[PDB]
Design a protein around this ligand. Structure first.
Ligand SMILES: *[C@@H]1O[C@H](CO)[C@@H](O[C@@H]2O[C@H](CO)[C@@H](O[C@@H]3O[C@H](CO[C@H]4O[C@H](CO[C@H]5O[C@H](CO)[C@@H](O)[C@H](O)[C@@H]5O)[C@@H](O)[C@H](O[C@H]5O[C@H](CO)[C@@H](O)[C@H](O)[C@@H]5O)[C@@H]4O)[C@@H](O)[C@H](O[C@H]4O[C@H](CO)[C@@H](O)[C@H](O)[C@@H]4O[C@H]4O[C@H](CO)[C@@H](O)[C@H](O)[C@@H]4O[C@H]4O[C@H](CO)[C@@H](O)[C@H](O)[C@@H]4O)[C@@H]3O)[C@H](O)[C@H]2NC(C)=O)[C@H](O)[C@H]1NC(C)=O
Ligand SMILES: *[C@@H]1O[C@H](CO)[C@@H](O[C@@H]2O[C@H](CO)[C@@H](O[C@@H]3O[C@H](CO)[C@@H](O)[C@H](O)[C@@H]3O)[C@H](O)[C@H]2NC(C)=O)[C@H](O)[C@H]1NC(C)=O
Lengths: 104, 52, 126, 110
């Protein structure tokens, strides 16, 4: 099926969804050095944004090859940030906790 | 750009080679702080370098 | 409540510089932007610029960059407007207004929402 | 440099519905929903009447309204009185953190 090559470290974005319930995968639960994967059943909406309005510059670095950088910021300076819903995230964490409690 | 809680950017000017390869001109650009490192261990708050 | 107070009257010869003080009371000075506009007699409202009290970030409209400057004093909570190179047509009332809310997540500087206005400073170059 | 295009004179009568429309370029009113209407009597400071095209601030009655279509915005006033004879200004956000005001209008009551 369609495989999404999304680059992420802590979370999984735009992945597949489980059929019935959250499913926990691990090579061996006894070994703490391994990495434990949790595949969710319901997605969690996440909205990231960069409010800054950057300007694209062009500098002739070498012959016939241009270099692009940030020239100036128009308006005020703000913080780029990501938003998720607290209630849905807490419910998802509780679901993951009850799923983990089977092994513990 | 002035003090604030934002990560902010640094306005750095440097000499770039123009279309003539034996001539230089002055240019400037805004760079992120993680991409900027002090050039040398000596105390100098005006001279910097890329992280590369 | 929210109160903005400026100078009453101002007389200045052409070619000099003028300082206008906008003192705000009744609310946190660093919570909202501060806008400066100008109104000539007969003519409507001309928008000059805005200033963020927290940082030193200021923005001015066209035909005013370099000619005017905006600063602030947080200890006394007073905005300063320094205008140089006064001409014969600069005889006008300068008004100080309160902009949007500073949130640090979206740009609220450009919203034209001015709840409160000062009495205005009348600069005369007659 | 040109400001927003606004009528210079609007006349009406008491107990009538009158609309004053201000229009601008494709960058000021074409894709931004920040249009405000202020009123100003001579000799005193202005005050807000309508903000965000159709919303109403606290302290203003239900006499005023608003609209937003294409590249123009209209202030509709129903039930005019003799107190409404003053200046009306239509302000908008022109992009790049710039605020632009209208040309100016003077409401007349016959
Ligand atoms: C990712 O997530 C983050 C969060 O994690 C998101 O960031 C959030 O983004 C939203 C919007 O996207 C923001 O909402 C705005 O919040 C501001 C903040 O207002 C609060 O703080 C005020 C200041 O408090 C101080 O003063 C008061 C005294 O005034 C004092 O008591 C208090 O202790 C403190 O010292 C409060 O005054 C204000 O109270 C108001 O609201 C209460 C309900 O919350 C209400 O009960 C009160 O009675 C009072 O009405 C509030 O606590 C809001 O101001 C802002 O709402 C304004 O702006 C929207 C949009 O422009 C507009 O539709 C509203 O009508 C409102 O407009 C008023 O303010 C304008 C100035 O900004 C003014 O010009 C207007 O005329 C209007 O004024 C009205 O009231 C005055 C009297 O004050 C009256 O004279 C007028 O006629 C008129 O009636 C938004 O709701 C969040 O704040 C922000 N979060 C954070 C943490 O910053 C981010 O967006 C997310 N990212 C994405 C991509 O989604
Ligand atoms: C974020 O920054 C961009 C880049 O400056 C802003 O776009 C710019 O918007 C202004 C409108 O205020 C444009 O000015 C117009 O230019 C045309 C000629 O192209 C002129 O005929 C008009 O009279 C007006 O001066 C400017 O061209 C445009 N720049 C680019 C590169 O598109 C944008 O508005 C900013 N975001 C916000 C929300 O303001």
């Amino acid at each position: 099926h369609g495989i999404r090559p999304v680059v992420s470290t802590q979370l999984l974005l735009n992945g597949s969804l489980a059929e019935k319930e959250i499913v926990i995968r691990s090579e061996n639960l006894t070994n703490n050095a391994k990495i434990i994967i949790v595949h969710l059943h319901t997605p969690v909406e996440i909205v990231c944004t960069r409010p800054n309005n950057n300007t694209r510059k062009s500098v002739r670095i070498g012959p016939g090859q241009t270099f692009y950088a940030t020239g100036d910021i128009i308006g005020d300076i703000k913080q780029a940030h990501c938003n998720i819903s607290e209630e849905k995230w807490n419910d998802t964490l509780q679901k993951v906790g009850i799923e983990l409690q089977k092994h513990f | 750009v002035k003090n604030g809680t934002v990560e902010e950017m640094k306005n750095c000017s440097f000499n770039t080679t123009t279309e003539i390869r034996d001539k230089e001109k002055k240019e400037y650009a805004l760079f992120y702080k993680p991409d900027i490192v002090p050039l040398s261990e000596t105390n100098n708050t005006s001279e910097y370098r890329l992280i590369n | 409540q929210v109160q903005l107070v400026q100078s009453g009257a101002e007389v200045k010869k052409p070619g000099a510089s003028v300082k206008v003080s906008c003192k705000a009371s009744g609310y946190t000075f660093t919570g909202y932007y501060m806008h400066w506009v100008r109104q000539a007699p007969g003519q409507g409202l001309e928008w000059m610029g805005w200033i963020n009290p927290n940082s030193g970030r200021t923005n001015y409209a066209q035909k005013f960059q370099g000619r005017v400057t905006m600063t602030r004093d947080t200890s006394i909570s007073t905005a300063y407007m320094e205008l140089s190179r006064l001409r014969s047509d600069d005889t006008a009332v300068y008004y100080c207004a309160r902009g949007g809310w500073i949130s640090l997540y979206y740009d609220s500087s450009g919203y034209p929402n001015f709840d409160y206005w000062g009495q205005g400073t009348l600069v005369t170059v007659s | 440099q040109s400001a927003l295009t606004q009528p210079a004179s609007v006349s009406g009568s008491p107990g009538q519905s009158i609309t004053i429309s201000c229009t601008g370029t494709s960058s000021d009113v074409g894709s931004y929903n920040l249009v405000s209407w202020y009123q100003q009597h001579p000799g005193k400071a202005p005050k807000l009447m309508i903000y965000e095209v159709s919303k109403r601030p606290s302290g203003v009655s239900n006499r005023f309204s608003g609209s937003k279509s294409g590249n123009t915005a209209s202030l509709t006033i129903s039930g005019l009185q003799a107190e409404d004879e003053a200046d009306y200004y239509c302000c908008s956000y022109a992009g790049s953190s710039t605020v632009i005001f209208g040309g100016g209008t003077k409401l007349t009551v016959l």
